Assembly symmetry: D4
Homo-oligomer: 149 residues x 8
């Protein structure tokens, strides 16, 4: 699905506030309230727009220890089953199959280093395909934002 | 600012759909349409709720090359100045001060390897504090989700 | 257990000399010999004060080769049993579960490199969960001190 | 200064409790209350005994973040000057010149990751000799003990 | 087989264009069309000249993602059988037994990172002798040429 | 410029022998001696076909030491200037800007380790941008071949 | 066995030439031909002097490729048996149990990279305890000498 | 200068004992006392035989700390100047320009870790070209021997 500058204008608007009214964007882009409705709806079926949701701040919820963990597996064919075990875990918010040293690269979000220690040892490291982990503790997270379409 | 099980119930709901009706949640948890408005508003002044926005899929917008780049600097004191230069780059969506080998650990989102090559050489590696970069290219991103509060 | 500046004053005093008399600290902080007795006793049940002991110098006892060893295990779930085997060894004075490359990070204190070689090969490396060790020999240990509460 | 089995017997006792009575040890080993006073005093002038102090638990005093930091310098001759700057930092409890990758290997003791981040950026990495740091965060410290002489 | 400067002159000529006529090189080097024919033929039986072929450009055929992959095997004796499995794959254009970290170092030529991901996971990583891969994605390939005999 | 199965059929043939007759291929695929001339000529203006050349074996010409060298630079912005110096070296047959640890990844082809040592010290490492090199020496090169389009 | 400056004087002399006559050293150090005989003989039973032998030059015997190899074993307890297999090999001239990454660090002396390749693959890498090798090829060996007692 | 089986027979003999009699070797191989004198003398002018010297054991002379040090330089062109400074150090017994991570790979022979620490800091790391050292300490040296020609 290709994308007008009308589509981009809508996305910028609704990416900053989901509740900015379609009738205000019509006035703004010089189109009808109705095309705006339809543009948005095409982008939903395209899979571009995935939902409207409140954004939350994990830190102000007391997640003081976020980290990335590189997982090294005992053998590389083990990725699909390792992944299946990891995904059952709520502390794992992201996971990637990347270049470089690691088989899997994941983010886990934890409340304390005591919590992180319990997850590593008892939830992640017990996963039988896993030979080693290397976790990179976030001490500061100054930039967090979005693609600017 | 500590939260109770009503605060969580509200969050779980509005993190799935920003647009669900305060009036349904009132019926759901057995409370007043007005306590829900207020709880949400406190979490806002708390900084727990940061906004209501539509979520977008970069893949569907043609961002086929996600990467994490680890930045190593000429000397470690250089971190504030390198950060300042990187944050002006819109292709940098995230940045972390972490443990381990790198000074700064960033995500860039790009459309192609040709684009990514242009950004590395022209925008990132032209930054004068930066000794070397190591980019980890995402081939697969099977888990992307949120803290489940 | 929280801590006055009376508590800190006592700790500084008794951390430099266990035998500095309670009746001298009373004079010094303008309290009774009896509160000092009781402050110390609360900190003992708190677990803050762990004991009074003579400090010894391993070097003047002929421990010329101290080292840290990073242990890499064949698989990560192996930590609890590896640790249980290590702890039986008197040359292992410390052990840590850390971030980074190693599964376990330990200090061993030895008299000579001939001694260190015998321990590595015959006591540590015979531990069956262990795939590799990497030992960092201390050549100089210029700072050794304490948290300053 | 070489030690016999009376010297060890004395050490083992006073390393467990600084306060045990010379008079009990005399009865224990079958010697004079006065030879024990003297043996201890020689070990003191030998530098084998360095003091009698209370031991403190950092954890109970709220030091939840222990770490080892490996320091890499811009050039290796810089070791004496970097050491001098680090030793003025009270959060650095230990420092080693070791083998392997790092120029200086230090322990810092901190209350939180927020504190540790402040010390890294503001106190440690502002040291001008220092190219990069690599900090290993302690998640667990199951063995902490002494040479058993 | 040793090599005149006549041999080199012929090779330079025919390395730039296979179709440069033998009767033009005769004029050029002051020999007969017939020795040129025979020189070339000796170099063919020597194995120096391996063929005449059109050179193609993989990039203009839409190979946007070339890479090198370092293969680490579970055990080193495994090289011959790993290699035998790899060679069945058309995306593997080169392979080397090198010094350094890797057991095998290979080039694979792919159309997209989606393609590369499918090969890694399903063709290369399924090879049972393989413990890990590390792939170095080519972002730019500015020099590609030949030995200049 | 997209290609059909006639374009591939032509390529497969002329990549094996540049000299096979357009007239045989016409009979082979059931088309005109003249459409084959034209298809080839379009692929030429497309840049898909770059030439017809004889292939040479470096081994048979006495190049016993092939190597890949990873170049690390003093600062990453230095890549264009280091590249320019390397490309003047005829022993450098290939060069890549890749991911991972190195700034530039090159192939050099040499006759002996004595030669290779002379090139490293005298021609490559004299380049002023270059902090360090890491050369991977080819001991075996069992697969060398082409994209199979 | 402790060592006079007479002992050192003899060793320097006989280390440069085994055939420098005892009666010349007597004149030189102002002692008898007979003490010199006896000094040397004590050092032999001490094990200090191990033999008199011609020194050879491997390079002028056509050993163009010397190397060090770091051996990584599948598990660390495997050292004694790995070593026993290695020692049967004539190309292995030295072996060390060292700190750092490798289980065993060895020197092998070879005539060519073709020879080195055959040894690695067929003699060293077939040793079943071995997971990986990393070989450091000597390109230049400018200093080779002796302790100066 | 190529050698036959008489040349080898001579070498094998005199590499075991420099002092065995030319007259016994003549009887042994069935040749003239005089051809043996001559063969040896050619190998001398060839540079194959470099001397006859007594071999010494460093261990028995109290060298308990052998090490290999890998030297990394600030820039790679610095190799000739760093070498020149190192070769003036008598504790450096060997030095190599090798492949892999290090610029220079050296052996130092030392009596204690206290000595080795003094040499590193005061003699080696004071060399201004040197960014960092990595020393591998020998704990065991089970194989030490010669090419068997
Ligand atoms: N995630 C993976 O297994 C990819 C692997 N680290 C590579 O680059 O080859
Ligand atoms: N980002 C930083 O500079 C922190 C550094 N990687 C450390 O662990 O010490
Ligand atoms: N000690 C451990 O297993 C922790 C591990 N090295 C990590 O950082 O993931
Ligand atoms: N601390 C040092 O500078 C010693 C260095 N890491 C070495 O092993 O050579
Ligand atoms: N390809 C190999 O197995 C060689 C190995 N990486 C070495 O240098 O020892
Ligand atoms: N060649 C480069 O500078 C790219 C670098 N190795 C990276 O991955 O970021
Ligand atoms: N050779 C060994 O196994 C020693 C090991 N590399 C260590 O330093 O712990
Ligand atoms: N000693 C050197 O500078 C050579 C370097 N280690 C390389 O492999 O390229
Ligand atoms: Mg959102
Ligand atoms: Mg104490
Ligand atoms: Mg060709
Ligand atoms: Mg000798």
């Amino acid at each position: 699905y290709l994308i007008d500058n009308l589509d981009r204008g809508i996305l910028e608007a609704l990416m900053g506030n989901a509740r900015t009214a379609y009738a205000e964007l019509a006035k703004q882009f010089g189109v009808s309230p109705e095309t705006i409705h339809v543009r948005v709806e095409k982008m939903k079926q395209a899979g571009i727009i995935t939902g409207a949701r409140i954004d939350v701040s994990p830190k102000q919820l007391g997640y003081d220890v976020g980290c990335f963990i590189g997982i090294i597996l005992k053998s590389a064919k083990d990725y699909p089953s390792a992944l299946a075990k990891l995904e059952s875990l709520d502390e794992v918010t992201e996971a990637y199959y990347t270049t470089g040293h690691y088989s899997i690269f994941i983010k886990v979000m934890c409340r304390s280093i005591d919590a992180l220690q319990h997850v590593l040892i008892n939830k992640i490291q017990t996963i039988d395909e896993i030979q080693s982990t290397e976790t990179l503790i976030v001490l500061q997270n100054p930039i967090m934002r979005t693609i600017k379409p």
